Write a protein that binds this DNA or RNA. Sequence first.
DNA 1: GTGCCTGGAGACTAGGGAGTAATCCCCTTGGCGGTTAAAACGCGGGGGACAGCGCGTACGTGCGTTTAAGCGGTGCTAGAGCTGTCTACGACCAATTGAGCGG
DNA 2: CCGCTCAATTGGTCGTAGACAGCTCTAGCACCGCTTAAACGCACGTACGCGCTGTCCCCCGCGTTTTAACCGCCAAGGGGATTACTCCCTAGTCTCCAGGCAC
Lengths: 74, 74, 88, 88, 90, 90, 76, 76
Amino acid sequence: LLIRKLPFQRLVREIAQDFKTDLRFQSSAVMALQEACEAYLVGLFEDTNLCAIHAKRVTIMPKDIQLARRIRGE
Amino acid sequence: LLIRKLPFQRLVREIAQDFKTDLRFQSSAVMALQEACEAYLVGLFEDTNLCAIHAKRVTIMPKDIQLARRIRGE
Amino acid sequence: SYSIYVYKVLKQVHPDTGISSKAMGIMNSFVNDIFERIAGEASRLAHYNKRSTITSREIQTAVRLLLPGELAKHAVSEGTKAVTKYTS
Amino acid sequence: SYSIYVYKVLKQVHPDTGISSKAMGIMNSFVNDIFERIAGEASRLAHYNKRSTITSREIQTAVRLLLPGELAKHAVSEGTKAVTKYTS
Amino acid sequence: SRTVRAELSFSVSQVERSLREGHYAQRLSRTAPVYLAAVIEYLTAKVLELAGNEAQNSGERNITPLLLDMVVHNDRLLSTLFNTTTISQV
Amino acid sequence: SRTVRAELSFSVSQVERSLREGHYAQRLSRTAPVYLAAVIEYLTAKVLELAGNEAQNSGERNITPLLLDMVVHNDRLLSTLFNTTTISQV
Amino acid sequence: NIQGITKPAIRRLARRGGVKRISGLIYEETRGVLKVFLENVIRDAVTYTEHAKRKTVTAMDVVYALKRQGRTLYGF
Amino acid sequence: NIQGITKPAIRRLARRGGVKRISGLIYEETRGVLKVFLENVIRDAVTYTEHAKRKTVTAMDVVYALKRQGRTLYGF
DNA sequence: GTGCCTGGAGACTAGGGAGTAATCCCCTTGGCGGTTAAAACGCGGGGGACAGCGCGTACGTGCGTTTAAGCGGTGCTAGAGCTGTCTACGACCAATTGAGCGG
DNA sequence: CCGCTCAATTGGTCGTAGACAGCTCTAGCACCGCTTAAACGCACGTACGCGCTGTCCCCCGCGTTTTAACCGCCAAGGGGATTACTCCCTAGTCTCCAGGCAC
């Protein structure tokens, strides 16, 4: 994994608090969410790098994430 | 519609020939395919125009269709 | 199938505005689609819990899953305030 | 559930190469997923034709629909040359 | 009648009968079709409420499919439900 | 036994029993599970044939999930089936 | 042929898409995208027709083929 | 907070994505994309847990929530 | 305007399927405390956005022509629904074997 | 290395679900004439890709120096999973009554 596990667990337990208070998570639910979130972010930066090369650049910019998410339908 | 109906019917009846020979189409199946194909192509050129503006251009190029289809997953 | 009730709700929501004949087929395919989507989601939820009876709770969960956000909150509130008015 | 047969096919395809314990759970979730996808597609195809019996023909069509291209041609050929070897 | 008893406009008995011919389970519930008819009634009375609001935001009398196509892809209230839909207009 | 009779490696009777507990229809067919077990057998003997072909060059003894993740997203033979899959590797 | 998808019909689809100016090589690429889209949808429509033991591809087979791509079509 | 998704963890995700150089404003946008992705998946996982009359979000509720986005996850 | 027929909501009975306790007990959360990697800060510099500047093309527009698509109209028959029988049917019980385990 | 047990196999039943035989009769295909709209072939005149070019600015590498992640302990209890009822809800009549139909 590439994100640290304890701040990602704090992030899931502070996002899920808005949906139902006082929830518990299995130890493998947080690792499934962390595996799916890095498999989402790498697949997002692979299209952001395509949108940054498309403009004849190397540095990715927030408009490249915004284009890769508007084309994808997000 | 924006594509002429008789060349689109010739296109469907020459694409479907590779799947099963001597098929017949309803008159509304071809219009559903033509409605879906222009609703596909306009939604494709709306992301191609975003990929062409993203490079600080106005003219769309084939690399803009190729980027809008690689980001979409085609 | 469901076209006779689309005009009946339209008489309540807009008793002055009429509807076309192609738009009735569009609203009837919309209703048969959101029906065969909600019932399909509730059958998968009845299978995931190994139940056999689709209750109103699997419909409330399939509405929470299918409809995004405020549309799910209002469809759950309308289904709840229709089942409670039904049992009374 | 299906983990006892994944190792049994692996003994035929590679009798020398072993498999891990996480990879068995991955192949078992793969098999339970392509099973609950093919059977779901064949139940929708049994509903679209208003039938009641899932025959092998709704499985051959759900394989043609789900698997793209050469994987569908080889899965149909293997299912056909297994049903014919079964009836004989 | 359960439709008037639930104070709905869609027939509950037809939604239950369509759940029976779909064979979505082995046995339904008592109040499951009343809930499903009230949710589909809400979605129809939310889409046609906007089609009737947009027809009078204009001089039209009936509701054409152009009004449905213009409303459901605008109007962020229900535009998320129709990301992948296409009204045929033919 | 119908599995040996069909010359398969997966149990037909378990696929039929899993079609029964899923309640995918009202009544199955004679070759409703022999065909399905031969197709799932083909897909397993096509994925693990490539995992065992790729381990040969690799030099590993067992099959790890890294081998499955490396094979199924390469190998255009079955990469179309796994466009939207993620092997967890944990 | 695919040549029936003419130059000004692709230009009208791009003008409706919001494109101001079109290069001279979009025309053969757009036909190659349309042919892939039809080869993906007509394959499923012919699969539903051969499964329904028919020889006429109805419009509900096309609606089911577009539904298997996340492109639900209302009005048929 | 979302600030736990640090600068070098987004940089490691971009280095694995193949990005050579990263602007100084990607870091707050990537957290805003990750928060939307988690708000879309955790909502469905909490919906499956409240439907299962549980209080512990298991890993199969997360697999079902990712399955409802076309992101099937093997290994749970 | 009300006779007369169609269907669906209330009794009315058998249920198996959720409800409800009730019980380990697993695990999950909750801490504390301690290495030590990972991040955070600041610095620097040079790599790369980047705006401007030409500058050579290829697209839109137009202006002619010119082809075929729609359309409108006949034939025609094909196979899509039918309907109406007309039979294999998977479902059930039941009666045999091969694998797992004991000696 | 043998004795004993068991879910897989395989005989009759009754399939009715699907096959199938036949009927029609849409309708979808087929063909010709024919406007005329839509496409098509050049000219050209640009607007505009496109390379390059210089300020420049800001991101990456590189010590630093923190910080809390992580690992390891234990303590607690809680809410899972299982079982055992169990009760009560829904599967099939009718019937009594509305709502659609004639004169």
